[PDB]
Ligand binder design. Structure first.
Ligand code: HEM
Ligand code: HEM
Ligand code: HEM
Ligand code: HEM
Ligand SMILES: N[C@@H](Cc1c[nH]c2ccccc12)C(=O)O
Ligand SMILES: N[C@@H](Cc1c[nH]c2ccccc12)C(=O)O
Ligand SMILES: N[C@@H](Cc1c[nH]c2ccccc12)C(=O)O
Ligand SMILES: N[C@@H](Cc1c[nH]c2ccccc12)C(=O)O
Ligand SMILES: N[C@@H](Cc1c[nH]c2ccccc12)C(=O)O
Ligand SMILES: N[C@@H](Cc1c[nH]c2ccccc12)C(=O)O
Ligand SMILES: N[C@@H](Cc1c[nH]c2ccccc12)C(=O)O
Ligand SMILES: N[C@@H](Cc1c[nH]c2ccccc12)C(=O)O
Lengths: 277, 280, 272, 262
């Protein structure tokens, strides 16, 4: 039994309210299941994908701000933004546990309705792959229906990635970074650089001296590990919902998702492990 | 690098698209922060609550189908929907971990833009409270500025709660349940009932005979516990973000949320703990 | 400011206490770090493995009891026990986030104290692997140093796995299970395809079998998730170095990730 | 040198002795849950002492890294309530009786941490008179500054207007909320760019406190579903007494300050 407290605002007709702020007429009218007749499991499928897109939208928002901080040598602010980015990635990774309550026989009841639609065609996800530095320009042909989107990806292809922004940062602080990281063709995905090995060994072996750099390396390594966790959980959900069936978007499915899982964002950070003392 | 596989569809201009299926133009233009100049932390804020509203939207949809299964005595199917249900609640509780990177000085550059806006005004939240049985008609009067959703809250206010559908299910199976659960003024929140004590002791003490009922008992305790934890984590974030300031919605804040934490949805379930044996 | 209630027992001078009951003296004296001087990270290292061994111990206990309920056609009870088993795998998966605060320059301070010791020689771990059906008789050799434990492991190798007991349950219920030495891995069987297809295609008749099939998919998935977090933790801390146990490291762990406990469960998704 | 030998797994894995006759299936969950928790509480103490030693030395980045691991331990501790909640009250009733008066209220390590964090209650030492040398370990943590008091000493070296009280004093008393720290915390939260170090430390302690309150709450919610409103084996009222610890605050001034910032 809880009594309405005095002082709670109740005439709200000419004022800003929660659904108005949050644009919830528009937000909560965006779920349009297409099964005929309605499948109970369709609503889950939509919500799960939409909550992920909202988190990915926020993750983009925070990564951009982390890059701006790095550029300005604002390390504590960068790392704070990065901690929120890791929490976002963690929420993403945690929501697979809802979709694990979707069995393949439930799925076959509406998989049909989706046609060729696939997360492979997520503009926001591809933006983030590109921003972390996994720059594949084949992936621009996917967005040929969409000139504005393909054009916002081109801007990210054309700019240094998160990692390349860290290398530039390191350069400004007298670490032995090649001049090529100051200007080069950024559309070309970072190639593993053996000469960065002694740089990262020197960081991790004077953590007293290179406390900021060592902090940032461990952040980046956290970011990558969490994104790979996201990919693995997605891929395990695939295995349990469609098995080894080809995807809606035309790919081989599990084997195609496995090829991303093999790839590495920040290669010299992990390579340094065989030699660090 | 990963090479684009040969069989990928790239020409989708006349077919159902991911973005059109998920109505992404619409969804990702619902974020309209009001700070001037722009505040970095406002988008976290809107997105935290928006993803919560989407989860709460999925939660009312599973809750409903759980009731329909209860009504039809479809118990395995009911428990399967409650398991999805508890996972939604479990994400809703886990996302608190993101907002806990919002400090009070951050929050202070935009809390003003909100005016009176408060999750206290969340229609879906209240729809679920009322559905789990916390039916307070004083809540209808906070929605008078919106007759349509006021009307939706009355439809649920007037139907049996989830708990009350459970008691009805027990009734159909020969358990010793009072006749009022058959027909009563469903708009009065359930009062704790001492006659249900021997019912639940019987279930918990003979789990081989009453396994279905027993497993559903534990589902509802799970559901209540997960919702308490959402409440508690929301309250703990209130304390770290605004301390003991009054809420934007007019309440005294933490103290006001503390009184909801004190409430219990399924009281005879927890009360039985005091007297239960020994499984036979 | 919290006052002690009158009523609270404060003279335990001769009674059963928390610590006497839990044997906390013997649990809490079991952390024996070898660094000279002490390395602050060694304690993490030790406790992380030990909580995990305690959880592996609880999982072996729960899984045997799921098998017993299964032998007995006690399906609700079997799933209740698979529910706790899942939660125990879930703690095992979660605690990886602590050891992920260990950096490689930290670890190089005491890695060498450890000699050849490795979770590869975790007896409880391997007990679980054999239980879930990943039986490799070559594993017995690594415990020849410990014949009580070696022989106990051999007893699990020669009994039906959790998966084999499910299939045998299905047989007692009129499922077209083949009439067909448990120490060999279970070879995948395309004649089980239609058995699984029938289960998933009429959930209202085979709701019990359907539930359990889904409980085993969950367990396998949670287990793979464990292997993956351990493996990603391996890449962050030793990269591609050879393991202390003498293996290739991440490579040898990847070969385990590619393995499947319940092949025909996953296989049936292509035809359902 | 083996895994099993390195980790003392013979004494570790024979420390589980259920007392129920005939043995109860659920007794092993029960034992393991409290034992894993104890091993985590042992790590948590090992880390927070280290973090105090870093603060004493003005080593902020090292202190923050150990507080990062410490939150992760608190996190496993809170998460594990999910296994224990598969135990139903009728299952518990099968072995509750073997337990006598034993209670987590007698956890030495829990109490060590309560006292480090600075909820010092000298009343507690009595519970432990049966173990006189563990009672004296406790008294050593009652006599030293808390983690919070060491933070306030840190601020004082660095030019914050911290009272003279906190330079030395009778640490055996719970810290008593102090209004004069308010302008202190306001300066810090209002000039993050100046006091980024202090600001981030302030936010870490708020994270430790919240997570510890979350452990308390999930423990309390478990006690409800398992024994409900019954008295505890240790002799308290049970839920009501635990609810009294939940209303306690470790670091009042950090939460008090939300009232006036910005
Ligand atoms: C159980 C439901 C799901 C199944 C069966 C599934 C399956 C697949 C398959 C087979 C692919 C490869 C592309 C293709 O051929 O379609 C794919 C890619 C993808 N999915 Fe899903 N997926 C599911 C849910 C989701 C959800 C909820 C999200 C969140 C938005 C998501 C995001 C992605 C993304 C971003 C890719 C591109 C991955 C890459 O390019 O490496 N998927 N998925
Ligand atoms: C950090 C941000 C938040 C703060 C400071 C906060 C604070 C408050 C306060 C002070 C109240 C009491 C009503 C009033 O006077 O305003 C309230 C209620 C509520 N908030 Fe929040 N809230 C926050 C975030 C959220 C979010 C993200 C959600 C998303 C679900 C949410 C959902 C609710 C709900 C449903 C209530 C009503 C609870 C009840 O009636 O028992 N809040 N909150
Ligand atoms: C920094 C921590 C760790 C590293 C660098 C590590 C490394 C390794 C490596 C390299 C192997 C392969 C065999 C070898 O050559 O030694 C292995 C196997 C193993 N580790 Fe770890 N491990 C770590 C922590 C842990 C923890 C905390 C546990 C918990 C028990 C664990 C359990 C295992 C198990 C069970 C195996 C064998 C798995 C199989 O045979 O497929 N490890 N580990
Ligand atoms: C079914 C499980 C449990 C029940 C029914 C339970 C019940 C209680 C009760 C009633 C109390 C208050 C004192 C008393 O009368 O004994 C208590 C205290 C305590 N329990 Fe538990 N408990 C449970 C599990 C656990 C576990 C797994 C731990 C892990 C270490 C734990 C740690 C504690 C601690 C540290 C206290 C004292 C807290 C304080 O002084 O504020 N408990 N428990
Ligand atoms: N990277 C982990 C642990 C950590 C905290 N501070 C650090 C400083 C340096 C290296 C690692 C850390 C985290 O950010 O939570
Ligand atoms: N690509 C997925 C389909 C999918 C999963 N989630 C989605 C969300 C929207 C559109 C399609 C999807 C499959 O092969 O089945
Ligand atoms: N309620 C817990 C444990 C459980 C599983 N099956 C049960 C059957 C009856 C009672 C409890 C249970 C869960 O669903 O995880
Ligand atoms: N009640 C909150 C305001 C709030 C929190 N989250 C929200 C989401 C949307 C609108 C308003 C809010 C406060 O008192 O500060
Ligand atoms: N496998 C999931 C979802 C589930 C619940 N009950 C089921 C019955 C049948 C199939 C799947 C389920 C779980 O155990 O929570
Ligand atoms: N095998 C690990 C060492 C290891 C990790 N956890 C352990 C626990 C106990 C003994 C050894 C270990 C390595 O290659 O470095
Ligand atoms: N307290 C959170 C958020 C955070 C990270 N860095 C910070 C610096 C200042 C204040 C808060 C933070 C954490 O430790 O991750
Ligand atoms: N205090 C508990 C008993 C208890 C719970 N967990 C424990 C672990 C060890 C010893 C006793 C306990 C009760 O009232 O039932």
């Amino acid at each position: 039994l809880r009594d309405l407290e005095p002082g709670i605002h109740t005439d709200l007709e000419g004022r800003l309210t929660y659904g108005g702020y949050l644009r919830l007429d528009q937000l909560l009218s965006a779920q349009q299941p297409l099964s005929e007749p309605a499948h109970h499991d369709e609503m889950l499928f939509i919500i799960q994908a939409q909550t992920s897109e909202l988190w990915l939208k926020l993750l983009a928002h925070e990564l951009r701000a982390a890059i701006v901080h790095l550029q300005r040598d604002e390390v504590w602010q960068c790392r704070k933004v990065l901690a929120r980015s890791k929490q976002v990635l963690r929420q993403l990774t945690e929501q697979w546990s809802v979709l694990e309550t979707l069995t393949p026989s439930e799925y076959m009841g509406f998989r049909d309705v989706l046609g060729p639609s696939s997360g492979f065609q997520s503009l926001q996800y591809r933006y983030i792959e590109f921003l972390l530095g996994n720059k594949n320009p084949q992936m621009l042909q996917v967005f040929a229906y969409d000139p504005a989107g393909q054009a916002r990806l081109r801007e990210v292809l054309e700019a240094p990635s998160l990692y390349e922004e860290f290398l530039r940062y390191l350069a400004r602080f007298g670490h032995a970074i090649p001049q090529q990281y100051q200007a080069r063709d950024w559309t070309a995905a970072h190639v593993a650089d053996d000469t960065l090995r002694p740089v990262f060994e020197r960081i991790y072996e004077n953590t007293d001296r290179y406390w900021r750099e060592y902090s940032l390396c461990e952040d980046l390594v956290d970011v990558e590990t969490q994104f790979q966790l996201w990919r693995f959980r997605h891929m395990r959900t695939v295995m349990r919902v469609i098995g080894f069936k080809r995807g809606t978007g035309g790919s081989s499915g599990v084997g195609f998702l496995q090829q991303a899982l093999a790839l590495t964002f920040f290669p010299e950070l992990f390579d340094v492990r065989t030699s660090v003392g």
